[PDB]
Amino acid sequence: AFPIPX
């Protein structure tokens, strides 16, 4: 997701 690398 944002701001999530997964």
Taken as a percent bin, the fraction of beta residues is under 5%
Largest sheet: none
Structural category is: little secondary structure
Number of strands: 0
Q: What overall geometry do the principal axes of the alpha carbons give?
A: flat
State the distance separating the first and last CA atoms.
Answer: 7 Å
Q: DSSP helix count?
A: 0
The radius of gyration is 4 Å
In percent, how helical is the residue content?
Answer: under 10%
PDB class: peptide binding protein
Keywords: cyclic peptides, peptide binding protein
Assembly: monomeric
Entry title: Connecting hydrophobic surfaces in cyclic peptides increases membrane permeability
Quick summary:
This protein has no helices and no strands. The protein is mostly loops and 6 residues long.
Annotate the secondary structure layout.
Elements: no helix or strand
PDB class: peptide binding protein
Keywords: cyclic peptides, peptide binding protein
Assembly: monomeric
Describe the 3D structure.
With 6 residues, this protein is mostly loops. Helices cover 0% and strands 0% of the residues. It contains no helices and no strands. The N and C termini lie close together (7 Å). 0% of the residues are buried. It is classed as peptide binding protein. Keywords: cyclic peptides, peptide binding protein. The assembly is monomeric. Connecting hydrophobic surfaces in cyclic peptides increases membrane permeability. The protein: Cyclic peptide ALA-MEA-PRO-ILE-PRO-ITZ. The organism is Homo sapiens.
